[PDB]
Amino acid sequence: LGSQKLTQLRDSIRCVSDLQIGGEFSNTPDQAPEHISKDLYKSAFFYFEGTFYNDKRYPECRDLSRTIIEWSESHDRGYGKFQTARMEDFTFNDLCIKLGFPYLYCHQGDCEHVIVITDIRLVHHDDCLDRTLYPLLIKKHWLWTRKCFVCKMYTARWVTNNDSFAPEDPCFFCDVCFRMLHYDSEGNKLGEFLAYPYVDPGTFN
């Protein structure tokens, strides 16, 4: 919605990089899940025609654009004259952009999404008229879902690297086939591996 703050769209973009759980759970897979990456790395920024609207709303937020502006303040790199902003003092109605031109939305460190303002139109009477739901999803992609590599009946909850049982190197397992292949009777890892929790992108996105 025009005249609707930025960070009203940043908080709406469903990306699975917000739901990834950190750390490795090989020794014991019953650990209290570390906070999803939505909570740990709260920083993000839009880039709209030479101005990094940074999400400095929270204290855990740090300037992701500082890296780029420093990297460009060095040796000339094509780019030049980068700006900054705060993304809570801005609405889409205050923004000076091109249509159909790719801009940036970086979040979770370097999960980059290419933003394209396809068109701008005055609101009609036959579309949604609310605001409580308006940065709303017109279309999404319906990605594929990874499955457990042992039995192809359930989706992958775990991804293991350097597994001394897996044929493939990154091997995805459901919970059942993971518990059954790597753990003797009480949680002592059998063999060697690095198991991480796997958020299926084709499910939470």
Place this chain on the structure above:
DNA sequence: CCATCAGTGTACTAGGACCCGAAAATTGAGTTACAGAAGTAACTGGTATACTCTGGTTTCTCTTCA
């Protein structure tokens, strides 16, 4: 009747070559130096496969002693 179990009708991948254009880089001529290395362009021996009388040979009647 609620279990199960191929097919199906598709956008969504997965390899798998392959192409289209752009931008950067080179090539090319022009000069004038510089030293040295390629790069043909030229006359001038040197030793073998035919080769041409020729020196010897060979019966074959004869020459010359004996």
